[PDB]
Amino acid sequence: RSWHYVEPKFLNKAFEVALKVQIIAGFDRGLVKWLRVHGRTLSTVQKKALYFVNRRYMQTHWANYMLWINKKIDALGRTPVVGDYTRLGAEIGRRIDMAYFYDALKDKNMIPKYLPYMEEINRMRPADVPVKYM
């Protein structure tokens, strides 16, 4: 519902990509499940659009864990390793609710235009794609 904007001084970008990869893999399991439901009517651009939706979902989802994980880490000043982050990633990827985003988006009818530029962005390696909070 609400969160505070705090800039971490011990933020490790290298560890962030490792965490991101684990989160993406978990989120992809639920992605195929959604595909099995609307697959028969899924357009070519819809498949690509979903990747964009997943990124937005991740940013929104991060807000929930931000207070629990990020706030404590920043306040403590400790620098967790890759192994510590992988455990956190499993918990993050345990809760998947893509249907909520779709339902909310459909309700307000704010469907973005299928642009080639957006498609290219999704095709870019996750490691080279910067992440931002809500």
PDB file of C-alpha atoms in Angstrom:
ATOM      1  CA  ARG A   1       0.000   0.000   0.000  1.00  0.00           C
ATOM      2  CA  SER A   2       2.738   2.452   0.988  1.00  0.00           C
ATOM      3  CA  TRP A   3       6.537   2.495   1.073  1.00  0.00           C
ATOM      4  CA  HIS A   4       9.422   4.874   1.750  1.00  0.00           C
ATOM      5  CA  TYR A   5      12.025   5.868  -0.830  1.00  0.00           C
ATOM      6  CA  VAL A   6      15.453   5.031   0.586  1.00  0.00           C
ATOM      7  CA  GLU A   7      18.667   5.010  -1.454  1.00  0.00           C
ATOM      8  CA  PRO A   8      21.007   2.142  -0.413  1.00  0.00           C
ATOM      9  CA  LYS A   9      24.724   2.887  -0.041  1.00  0.00           C
ATOM     10  CA  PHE A  10      25.770  -0.775   0.038  1.00  0.00           C
ATOM     11  CA  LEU A  11      23.799  -1.697  -3.094  1.00  0.00           C
ATOM     12  CA  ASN A  12      25.694  -4.245  -5.193  1.00  0.00           C
ATOM     13  CA  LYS A  13      24.666  -4.214  -8.867  1.00  0.00           C
ATOM     14  CA  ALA A  14      26.452  -7.514  -9.587  1.00  0.00           C
ATOM     15  CA  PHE A  15      24.416  -9.323  -6.929  1.00  0.00           C
ATOM     16  CA  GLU A  16      21.230  -7.669  -8.210  1.00  0.00           C
ATOM     17  CA  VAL A  17      21.411  -9.419 -11.592  1.00  0.00           C
ATOM     18  CA  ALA A  18      21.853 -12.809  -9.880  1.00  0.00           C
ATOM     19  CA  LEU A  19      18.712 -12.143  -7.842  1.00  0.00           C
ATOM     20  CA  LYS A  20      16.837 -10.888 -10.915  1.00  0.00           C
ATOM     21  CA  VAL A  21      17.575 -14.090 -12.860  1.00  0.00           C
ATOM     22  CA  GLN A  22      16.213 -16.300 -10.061  1.00  0.00           C
ATOM     23  CA  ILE A  23      13.079 -14.150  -9.827  1.00  0.00           C
ATOM     24  CA  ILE A  24      12.528 -14.247 -13.604  1.00  0.00           C
ATOM     25  CA  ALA A  25      12.769 -18.057 -13.731  1.00  0.00           C
ATOM     26  CA  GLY A  26      10.142 -18.409 -11.001  1.00  0.00           C
ATOM     27  CA  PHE A  27       7.849 -15.882 -12.691  1.00  0.00           C
ATOM     28  CA  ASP A  28       8.163 -17.741 -16.001  1.00  0.00           C
ATOM     29  CA  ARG A  29       6.552 -20.881 -14.563  1.00  0.00           C
ATOM     30  CA  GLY A  30       3.307 -18.995 -13.993  1.00  0.00           C
ATOM     31  CA  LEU A  31       3.631 -17.291 -17.378  1.00  0.00           C
ATOM     32  CA  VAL A  32       3.195 -20.555 -19.297  1.00  0.00           C
ATOM     33  CA  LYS A  33       0.147 -21.400 -17.155  1.00  0.00           C
ATOM     34  CA  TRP A  34      -1.529 -18.157 -18.246  1.00  0.00           C
ATOM     35  CA  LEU A  35      -0.561 -18.931 -21.849  1.00  0.00           C
ATOM     36  CA  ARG A  36      -2.381 -22.277 -21.662  1.00  0.00           C
ATOM     37  CA  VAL A  37      -5.636 -20.399 -20.954  1.00  0.00           C
ATOM     38  CA  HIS A  38      -5.621 -17.707 -23.682  1.00  0.00           C
ATOM     39  CA  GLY A  39      -3.150 -19.442 -26.001  1.00  0.00           C
ATOM     40  CA  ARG A  40      -5.765 -20.291 -28.641  1.00  0.00           C
ATOM     41  CA  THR A  41      -6.555 -16.576 -29.058  1.00  0.00           C
ATOM     42  CA  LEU A  42      -3.066 -15.249 -28.292  1.00  0.00           C
ATOM     43  CA  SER A  43      -1.794 -12.914 -31.023  1.00  0.00           C
ATOM     44  CA  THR A  44       1.867 -12.602 -32.056  1.00  0.00           C
ATOM     45  CA  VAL A  45       2.224  -9.198 -30.353  1.00  0.00           C
ATOM     46  CA  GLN A  46       0.433 -10.397 -27.188  1.00  0.00           C
ATOM     47  CA  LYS A  47       3.214 -12.902 -26.478  1.00  0.00           C
ATOM     48  CA  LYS A  48       5.841 -10.150 -26.698  1.00  0.00           C
ATOM     49  CA  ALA A  49       3.581  -7.770 -24.742  1.00  0.00           C
ATOM     50  CA  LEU A  50       3.404 -10.265 -21.862  1.00  0.00           C
ATOM     51  CA  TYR A  51       7.176 -10.043 -21.367  1.00  0.00           C
ATOM     52  CA  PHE A  52       6.717  -6.299 -20.858  1.00  0.00           C
ATOM     53  CA  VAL A  53       3.848  -7.010 -18.441  1.00  0.00           C
ATOM     54  CA  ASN A  54       6.075  -9.385 -16.461  1.00  0.00           C
ATOM     55  CA  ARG A  55       8.672  -6.632 -15.995  1.00  0.00           C
ATOM     56  CA  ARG A  56       5.967  -4.218 -14.776  1.00  0.00           C
ATOM     57  CA  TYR A  57       4.639  -6.961 -12.503  1.00  0.00           C
ATOM     58  CA  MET A  58       8.104  -7.529 -11.036  1.00  0.00           C
ATOM     59  CA  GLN A  59       8.486  -3.803 -10.298  1.00  0.00           C
ATOM     60  CA  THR A  60       5.069  -3.707  -8.603  1.00  0.00           C
ATOM     61  CA  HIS A  61       5.716  -6.968  -6.734  1.00  0.00           C
ATOM     62  CA  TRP A  62       9.093  -5.643  -5.520  1.00  0.00           C
ATOM     63  CA  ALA A  63       7.288  -2.923  -3.545  1.00  0.00           C
ATOM     64  CA  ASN A  64       5.756  -5.565  -1.247  1.00  0.00           C
ATOM     65  CA  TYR A  65       9.152  -7.101  -0.415  1.00  0.00           C
ATOM     66  CA  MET A  66      10.997  -3.750  -0.527  1.00  0.00           C
ATOM     67  CA  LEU A  67      10.020  -2.817   3.035  1.00  0.00           C
ATOM     68  CA  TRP A  68      10.772  -6.293   4.394  1.00  0.00           C
ATOM     69  CA  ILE A  69      14.032  -7.077   2.554  1.00  0.00           C
ATOM     70  CA  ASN A  70      15.556  -3.788   1.299  1.00  0.00           C
ATOM     71  CA  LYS A  71      14.721  -1.661   4.356  1.00  0.00           C
ATOM     72  CA  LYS A  72      16.293  -4.153   6.779  1.00  0.00           C
ATOM     73  CA  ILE A  73      19.412  -4.651   4.625  1.00  0.00           C
ATOM     74  CA  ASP A  74      20.007  -0.905   4.234  1.00  0.00           C
ATOM     75  CA  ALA A  75      19.432  -0.199   7.936  1.00  0.00           C
ATOM     76  CA  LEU A  76      21.719  -3.059   9.020  1.00  0.00           C
ATOM     77  CA  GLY A  77      24.459  -2.060   6.589  1.00  0.00           C
ATOM     78  CA  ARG A  78      25.291  -5.712   5.949  1.00  0.00           C
ATOM     79  CA  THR A  79      26.094  -6.896   2.423  1.00  0.00           C
ATOM     80  CA  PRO A  80      24.318 -10.228   1.653  1.00  0.00           C
ATOM     81  CA  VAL A  81      26.028 -12.651  -0.738  1.00  0.00           C
ATOM     82  CA  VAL A  82      24.646 -14.462  -3.806  1.00  0.00           C
ATOM     83  CA  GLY A  83      23.604 -17.457  -1.704  1.00  0.00           C
ATOM     84  CA  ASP A  84      21.635 -15.211   0.657  1.00  0.00           C
ATOM     85  CA  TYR A  85      19.900 -13.520  -2.284  1.00  0.00           C
ATOM     86  CA  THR A  86      18.992 -16.813  -3.988  1.00  0.00           C
ATOM     87  CA  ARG A  87      17.032 -17.834  -0.868  1.00  0.00           C
ATOM     88  CA  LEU A  88      15.157 -14.519  -0.950  1.00  0.00           C
ATOM     89  CA  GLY A  89      14.460 -14.942  -4.659  1.00  0.00           C
ATOM     90  CA  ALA A  90      12.711 -18.263  -4.069  1.00  0.00           C
ATOM     91  CA  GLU A  91      10.310 -16.582  -1.629  1.00  0.00           C
ATOM     92  CA  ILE A  92       9.685 -13.739  -4.098  1.00  0.00           C
ATOM     93  CA  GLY A  93       9.043 -16.166  -6.955  1.00  0.00           C
ATOM     94  CA  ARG A  94       6.749 -18.245  -4.739  1.00  0.00           C
ATOM     95  CA  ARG A  95       3.910 -15.726  -5.040  1.00  0.00           C
ATOM     96  CA  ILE A  96       2.754 -15.164  -8.620  1.00  0.00           C
ATOM     97  CA  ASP A  97      -0.443 -13.316  -9.562  1.00  0.00           C
ATOM     98  CA  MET A  98      -0.348 -12.235 -13.220  1.00  0.00           C
ATOM     99  CA  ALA A  99      -4.147 -12.508 -13.386  1.00  0.00           C
ATOM    100  CA  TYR A 100      -4.481  -9.544 -11.007  1.00  0.00           C
ATOM    101  CA  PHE A 101      -2.457  -7.272 -13.316  1.00  0.00           C
ATOM    102  CA  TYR A 102      -4.429  -8.414 -16.368  1.00  0.00           C
ATOM    103  CA  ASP A 103      -7.790  -7.935 -14.632  1.00  0.00           C
ATOM    104  CA  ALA A 104      -6.839  -4.472 -13.343  1.00  0.00           C
ATOM    105  CA  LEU A 105      -5.432  -3.445 -16.736  1.00  0.00           C
ATOM    106  CA  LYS A 106      -8.520  -4.733 -18.564  1.00  0.00           C
ATOM    107  CA  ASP A 107     -10.857  -2.959 -16.116  1.00  0.00           C
ATOM    108  CA  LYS A 108      -9.309   0.455 -16.840  1.00  0.00           C
ATOM    109  CA  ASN A 109      -8.849  -0.468 -20.536  1.00  0.00           C
ATOM    110  CA  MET A 110      -5.351   1.053 -20.658  1.00  0.00           C
ATOM    111  CA  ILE A 111      -3.884  -1.326 -23.235  1.00  0.00           C
ATOM    112  CA  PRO A 112      -0.582  -0.021 -24.723  1.00  0.00           C
ATOM    113  CA  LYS A 113       0.017   0.019 -28.480  1.00  0.00           C
ATOM    114  CA  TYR A 114       2.073  -2.871 -29.862  1.00  0.00           C
ATOM    115  CA  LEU A 115       5.221  -0.975 -30.850  1.00  0.00           C
ATOM    116  CA  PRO A 116       8.380  -2.549 -32.381  1.00  0.00           C
ATOM    117  CA  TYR A 117      10.562  -0.451 -30.057  1.00  0.00           C
ATOM    118  CA  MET A 118       8.965  -2.011 -26.972  1.00  0.00           C
ATOM    119  CA  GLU A 119       9.448  -5.463 -28.493  1.00  0.00           C
ATOM    120  CA  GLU A 120      13.159  -4.734 -29.005  1.00  0.00           C
ATOM    121  CA  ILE A 121      13.493  -3.625 -25.374  1.00  0.00           C
ATOM    122  CA  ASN A 122      12.020  -6.920 -24.141  1.00  0.00           C
ATOM    123  CA  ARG A 123      14.452  -8.835 -26.366  1.00  0.00           C
ATOM    124  CA  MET A 124      17.386  -7.071 -24.657  1.00  0.00           C
ATOM    125  CA  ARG A 125      19.382  -9.174 -22.169  1.00  0.00           C
ATOM    126  CA  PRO A 126      17.962  -8.793 -18.585  1.00  0.00           C
ATOM    127  CA  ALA A 127      21.490  -8.138 -17.289  1.00  0.00           C
ATOM    128  CA  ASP A 128      21.718  -4.968 -19.401  1.00  0.00           C
ATOM    129  CA  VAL A 129      18.193  -3.859 -18.451  1.00  0.00           C
ATOM    130  CA  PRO A 130      18.141  -1.375 -15.502  1.00  0.00           C
ATOM    131  CA  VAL A 131      15.519  -1.825 -12.781  1.00  0.00           C
ATOM    132  CA  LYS A 132      13.478   0.844 -10.996  1.00  0.00           C
ATOM    133  CA  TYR A 133      11.099   0.782  -8.031  1.00  0.00           C
ATOM    134  CA  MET A 134       7.535   2.115  -8.005  1.00  0.00           C
TER     135      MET A 134
END
